[model samples]
Target: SRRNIVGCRIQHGWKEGNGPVTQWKGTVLDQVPVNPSLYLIKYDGFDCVYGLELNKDERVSALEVLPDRVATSRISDAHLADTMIGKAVEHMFETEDGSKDEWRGMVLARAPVMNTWFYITYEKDPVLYMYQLLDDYKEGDLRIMPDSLVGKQVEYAKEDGSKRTGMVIHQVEAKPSVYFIKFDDDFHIYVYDLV
Candidate 1:
């Protein structure tokens, strides 16, 4: 029997008009009724589902059905260090001037000279090389951190069964913020229910 691919993570490849080949990770939801080869996929950061064909041939179709790896928590750090090789990963790159940008690429191999560094080549520019340490990487489906939640309105629940709405003056983390109205040192509230 064919291995069930539903609910598995995979890389779906596509090319825009006059653009280079690009692939993104997605979770397979189900197979379409009429076409068994076409699977409904929910891509990272996208709410809509797309039907994609399973094609291992890079020349014809660049779809890649990758195997599931053990969770990092279940494995030792030593094993986790080498498991990231040959997988696609996203990282934030900082230039010498201090400007930072995000890039996604495939991990080619570990650097022979640098024991902890691995070489990466991106989809847009395969020839250009980028190196990253084993401790500083994650799978390609990296969650893009949301924009800072500072300078927003928020409501805080009080111990006296009362709620106060206040303007968020500053944010230390993306989820929690400091408001102007009630300056409680131990105030801990998420910014999800912003007023």
Candidate 2:
């Protein structure tokens, strides 16, 4: 099996260090052996694995699950509907067109090994994205926006299902590297990070 990696953001950290292998939480955006060098990979800069060629395919799994996703098609009716019922699972990413946006509870049902559909779900919002503010960021698409959102009047959405508006004081390079907002709404002071 792909084991612990199919759902975990992972990569190699030993080529540059040339010591022991290390692991860090990172979004595994199936790349051309290249990924954005996010801060989570700072100590060793492993997110750049896609920039260079490496035996990641050969080294990822102990044996099976070489391929990351499972395709189901051309098989008999193994249509068992209660295999992983009520089982808790995790989701790091989703498609742009929104197909796999199903329930994250359990297997729900089992079908042929290929060319078929399965069910899944998730409750917690996956920390799959780097906190982005004022500009868009991709490998070669990073853009710079107005510096220091602090001391400026602002309105922003927090990840926890709420929104706030206030004036900025100063920006903090907080963990996850987001625009940490220090808000003074002419009432109470509210400070938090924006993604």
Candidate 3:
């Protein structure tokens, strides 16, 4: 917490992406200074609340207050999400429709359901994107049944619960209806995860 936290550095992972700013651009429900060099702030975004801690030379900038008088009477912080500490988690993007997007990542540390701040490695940089827990988080096996959903632009939700469309990048056999489809994030579906 006392270290000089800057942009993505060698000390931090830059393969995907990471940053110094630990909070999202949203409403700051509450702010508390734990000490002269550190502070605790709660930020709320799109149906979620994140509890984050600030460093000595830092101040909650994107913090805001909601119109409705509300406060998260809970507590939060993100350390495990920073280093991950070698804890593997089932990380995957959610779908918009009711389909499964198996672009899962191995999340370390612990990501639990809390109304506080959370850190995630979406792009794998050094910066951690702040997020909140959700009780309505989708469940059930989202993997598409074999031979089904081919060439279908199924809308899927990201780990952030945002909607996206991943199509299976592949060429169909001219002689047969067989889909020699491949998979890619930019595509509509994940063929490797399916059949």
Candidate 4:
């Protein structure tokens, strides 16, 4: 059972400077040599590794394992409502000198363990930025407009009893009155079905 815990995220309670012990997120590296009861972990913002007891309450029960690229087919349409996969996005970045700058990147993938977290890679950066689809960012594909309704907005209701705002993306050539609107989650709908 312990072997299944590798690469799991855990809460590491530790102290910094003269402050009280605080909880920080950490990842399980591996089991201690000749000591299966103890595990080696490294905190996210810290540079040191610590051995923690396995049976403690530090482990995150909801997310037993770390994030990974899941099969696209397994992702639910409801979860993809917030953002589209493999699309360009822009966000504001705060520098060390308290200056605000803009950065652009592409949405790589969503975390399988959580629907809210997404992985992005920015221009000229080697690291992937994990974000929570915050309000500060803007997605490139958010308000895509179809050629038919160049300046129109429509709301599409889903069978799940929820509605989404989008514009038509395609129109049937043979049927001039038929238009298909694609929502943020990539669900296509007939224009007549939307209000």
Candidate 5:
């Protein structure tokens, strides 16, 4: 049988010329189901803990710590919401070191193992940036967006529960390169970083 899961967020600081300091707090977002008998609880960044079962009184029991590499397919809308919140956290913490005020692009993808919601961004092109919840880390890698794919139309589900297709407008050749497209007003410019 699968074990129940629980997750919490942590804040850490590096002391000048010293070791690291860390603090943990209960998840900011409450429990949400990823599938039958399985749930993901949002913590800091895009990190979440899974596999929790609750008692009749709404109290949790049998909590297990899921590995960071487990793959899952049960995605909850709440997970998506948490992802957006994580983006806000990122924007606030990002260093504004003489860069433009525009967001090059954004991509929504399923976490490889957790099947949970995660997003990546391309500020320029040819390089893709991905956020990993388990490591509490951000990584940059090389990817290529083919020019031939430009202007290609693809369909995606919108936040308002609507289906729509959009045309690719731009392609950038970078690590984890970015593809730019025009969707509805909601995501006027859809960005996907090649994984």
Candidate 6:
């Protein structure tokens, strides 16, 4: 019968000065017949399960697991430029209603290193430009732009209608599609199709 199965064996870790610190420090979560491979073991407070490579002594080594195929580290500016270029090219081909001509600009925001935020802006019409944060060391205010204000030198306004000036760094041709820009801070910018 299934009730004949034995209970799992647990090991307790001891403290130097005090007595037994925990009742059961570790437990054999699972046992499989696959040889020369690691087992996924889950513990409390972990977002994902950790891999446990049980060799001769049951010791485990933790491996870095990325959330997606995109590398979440310092990415080259040229790569970011390429991603944006592709989006622009796609926008030119996919837009059906001829609304691309009216778009002024768009912004891309990313949080590469967990808590840090970075962004890039693209403008359209007569002049095409792409702007990114020059420095990752400093944290500053958030700037959001409207598509109606493309190509023209306009003041960065707060929601309450105050004027601020922002610098433009690079210029490129305006295409009518989505584009991707990766920042040094590991955040990604996705340029959307003009509506």
Residue-wise C-alpha lDDT for candidate 1, range 112-138, written one tens digit per residue: 323454444454543224243444545
Compared with the true structure, all predictions reach lDDT values of 0.47, 0.30, 0.31, 0.48, 0.38, 0.29
lDDT of 5 at 126: 22
Task: Put the candidates in TM-score order, highest first.
Answer: 4, 1, 3, 5, 2, 6
The parts of candidate 1 lying over 4 Å away from their true place are: 56-60, 69-195
Model 1 lDDT-worst window of ten: 178-187
Give the winner by lDDT: 2 or 5. Answer: 5
Q: In model 3, which range of ten residues has the least summed lDDT? A: 7-16
Per-candidate TM-scores read: 0.31, 0.19, 0.27, 0.37, 0.25, 0.17
Between candidates 1 and 3, name the one with more favorable lDDT: 1
Locate the minimum summed-lDDT window of 10 residues in model 6: 1-10
Please state the error at residue 70 of candidate 1 in Å: 11
Badly placed stretches (over 4 Å) of model 3 are: 1-25, 29-69, 73-86, 106-114, 123-127, 131-195
Clashes of each: 0, 17, 29, 0, 18, 6
Give the number of colliding residue pairs in candidate 4.
0
lDDT of 2 at 125: 23
In candidate 6, residue 7 scores what lDDT? 18
Steric clash pairs (candidate 4) = none
* TM-score-best of 2 and 4: 4
Write one digit per residue (lDDT tens) for candidate 2, span 86-129.
23333223357865443222222221222233322223322112
Minimum summed lDDT over a 10-residue window in model 2 is located at: 33-42
